[PDB]
Write an enzyme that holds these catalytic residues in place. Structure first.
Site, mmCIF file in Angstrom:
data_model
loop_
_atom_site.group_PDB
_atom_site.id
_atom_site.type_symbol
_atom_site.label_atom_id
_atom_site.label_comp_id
_atom_site.label_asym_id
_atom_site.label_seq_id
_atom_site.Cartn_x
_atom_site.Cartn_y
_atom_site.Cartn_z
ATOM 1 N N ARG A 158 45.074 42.922 47.877
ATOM 2 C CA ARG A 158 44.470 42.135 46.709
ATOM 3 C C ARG A 158 42.943 42.410 46.583
ATOM 4 O O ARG A 158 42.416 42.523 45.470
ATOM 5 C CB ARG A 158 44.671 40.706 46.882
ATOM 6 C CG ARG A 158 46.098 40.490 46.324
ATOM 7 C CD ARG A 158 46.287 38.597 46.101
ATOM 8 N NE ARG A 158 46.019 37.898 47.240
ATOM 9 C CZ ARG A 158 47.003 37.487 48.175
ATOM 10 N NH1 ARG A 158 48.332 38.291 48.066
ATOM 11 N NH2 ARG A 158 46.812 36.718 48.832
ATOM 12 N N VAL A 159 42.273 42.766 47.728
ATOM 13 C CA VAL A 159 41.030 43.377 47.502
ATOM 14 C C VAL A 159 40.991 44.976 46.742
ATOM 15 O O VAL A 159 40.180 44.977 45.829
ATOM 16 C CB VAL A 159 40.417 43.527 48.867
ATOM 17 C CG1 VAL A 159 39.097 44.333 48.483
ATOM 18 C CG2 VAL A 159 40.472 42.299 49.518
#
Lengths: 157, 192, 85, 156, 156
Positions: free
Chosen positions: C33-34
């Protein structure tokens, strides 16, 4: 099952037997795609043992992933190379079988012990196409690869 | 009835669905070129058993529909094996192919209606003979690639429905395994 | 539990492993998700192209052993795809 | 389920009804392959009754095993021998349906009672290929085989 | 599953954000066929609101059918009726996009908040054909239909 599942991490090498395989007459009924060893490393067994081992597993995984598809769409829809690995994989599945001394009462075959070098060479050779002309059954329930050539002649009639 | 089974069955049928859909479109493109090529070959067509099919199956009752009207030349790999030329149907039939066939020498072939329908001097004779071989041949692949397109459409839709139905079964089994496993734990805990 | 707690997952699969995909990462399912925020500019550049070309490969990957008369555009997806893999 | 599973051992005959079969409109919805009887023995029913019964069940089981391929690929991919067992099997399935007096409101057909001899004969004839020319739907919701033949002629 | 099933009994609408749509550059990435409303009813919203939305749906659903006949025969073998719905549908797809005020920093475009009567009007007219003469990318990342005119002029 919690019991077997918890046992795996206590082991350096595992042999997984399968009823689906036994059912076929393939004995020992070892799953070639679920047995592992800590020493299956090219720096330990050498790159030749390792590359053959990995090649055998690849051709069996590819066959496994074809099985159900061609079982419906037919053998004819395959390219002449997809069906090459089908014939080869089926020979290899048979060449992994082996009559055990201790299993003579069940097989009706005399037991065989096969040296490492011969095991490697045998599978090397089927992988390389060297026996595309022999029939599947010649590879069933023998020791070394010479016994499969012998058997092929015996089958001819 | 095992989560193990269901997952395997689901894996194969998702790929079958994907294959039959690609095969559907391969045939759709081939039927496209074949129906347009059929125009300058029908009016052209207006002016011992020969069985015209092809090499490839999965086109429903193309090959068996002529083999029934059969019972002696068999053009198409599939006609010789169910009952003599290989490598047909795959590449569109040239007038040249029709001559290769006639050189080696009633005609039975499939006549294209729609995508969904089909029904089963001595220097002059050689040109009018090859004019029939070609005609039957052009009519045939139009009928084969239509049929295969249709049959592969149906198999894709059938696989898709089976996928839906097996996913439902999967989740019902999935929920019941959780519940059954929990009820076992509870009953044991309670009995103490 | 641990899937919802974390920022992303690297999914490994047995079947990828024996096919020769080692490390056996399911690149279609794995997620971070980063993402890009944690990549250098040089990686970001080429990784972005790889991602897209692999996604477009995955759409078609079953026409591989059942594809004789595919259009040249999709033989290109298949080919770029097996190579990136 | 524990309840029905435990009950099986208490019976000399079991008639197992199937929702799948009901939803196809086969009535009564008896599973031909799940219903059994302790007197289905050639020494009790005689060998003709026994043999016809076993022949029906074989064709039905044969058909059942072909049904995976039918569902994906359809009829067209079958060999000519398998197309035959399919068409005989489907005829047998329908010939096992029957109008009940009690169910006249639901079938729209008058109730039938079929003597055992006419039951044996009917299925014996279907199996022997004597009606491969008649359509399937003629065997649906009739009494004796004669009615399915009359029904066949009526379907013009 | 009990958790989602228990939740759905309370839901009056779904908004389905879709990765497919996002990769096509349509913001917001709302799936216009997958998202639903319970109050999408002529007895609750307009009889005019309802028919515009139903009309938008049918054309977007119809555009999807034709998408197999495009990568086979090319977008020319279509009839004049079928070419018209492609041209209108694509303008509708793009007209469903919107520049957001909340994303003025990252993008650069100015934010739009479209009134309900203008939204209904816009779509009603693309369906009518009152903008068939305009180019396809005139409808993308605009607010009301008045900016579809202003953007189609600035491209000339």
């Amino acid at each position: 099952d919690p019991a077997p599942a918890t046992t795996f991490a206590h082991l350096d090498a595992t042999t997984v037997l399968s009823r689906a395989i036994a059912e076929l007459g393939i004995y020992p009924a070892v799953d070639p795609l679920d047995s592992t060893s800590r020493i299956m490393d090219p720096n330990i067994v050498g790159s030749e043992h390792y590359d053959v081992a990995r090649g055998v597993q690849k051709i069996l995984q590819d066959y496994k992933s074809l099985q159900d598809i061609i079982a419906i769409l037919g053998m004819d829809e395959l390219s002449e190379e997809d069906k090459l690995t089908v014939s080869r994989a089926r020979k290899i599945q048979r060449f992994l079988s082996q009559p055990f001394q201790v299993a003579e009462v069940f097989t009706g075959h005399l037991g065989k012990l096969v040296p490492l070098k011969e095991t490697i060479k045998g599978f090397q050779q089927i992988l390389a196409g060297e026996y595309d002309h022999l029939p599947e059954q010649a590879f069933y329930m023998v020791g070394p690869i010479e016994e499969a050539v012998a058997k092929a002649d015996k089958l001819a009639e | 009835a095992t989560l193990k089974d269901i997952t395997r069955r689901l894996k194969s049928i998702k790929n079958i669905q994907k294959i039959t859909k690609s095969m559907k479109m391969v045939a759709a493109a081939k039927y496209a070129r074949a129906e347009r090529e059929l125009k300058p070959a029908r009016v052209y067509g207006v002016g011992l058993i020969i069985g015209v099919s092809s090499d490839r199956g999965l086109c429903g009752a193309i090959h068996s529909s002529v083999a029934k009207q059969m019972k002696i030349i068999g053009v198409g790999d599939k006609i010789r094996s169910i009952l003599t030329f290989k490598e047909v149907g795959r590449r569109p039939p040239t007038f040249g192919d029709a001559s290769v066939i006639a050189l080696e020498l009633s005609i039975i072939f499939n006549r294209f209606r729609s995508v969904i329908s089909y029904k089963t001097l001595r220097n002059y004779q050689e040109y009018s003979l090859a004019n029939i071989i070609y005609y039957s041949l052009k009519e045939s692949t139009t009928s084969e690639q239509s049929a295969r397109m249709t049959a592969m459409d149906n198999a894709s839709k059938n696989a898709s429905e089976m996928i839906d139905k097996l996913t439902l079964t999967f989740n019902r089994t999935r929920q019941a395994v959780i519940t059954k496993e929990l009820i076992e734990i509870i009953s044991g805990a309670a009995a103490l | 539990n641990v899937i919802s707690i974390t920022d992303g997952q690297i999914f490994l699969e047995t079947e990828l492993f024996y096919k020769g995909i080692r490390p056996a990462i399911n690149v279609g399912l794995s997620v971070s998700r980063v993402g890009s925020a944690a990549q250098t500019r040089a990686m970001k550049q080429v990784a972005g192209t790889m991602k897209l070309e692999l996604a477009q490969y995955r759409e078609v990957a079953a026409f591989a052993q059942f594809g004789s008369d595919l259009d040249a555009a999709t033989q290109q997806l298949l080919s770029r795809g097996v190579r990136l893999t």
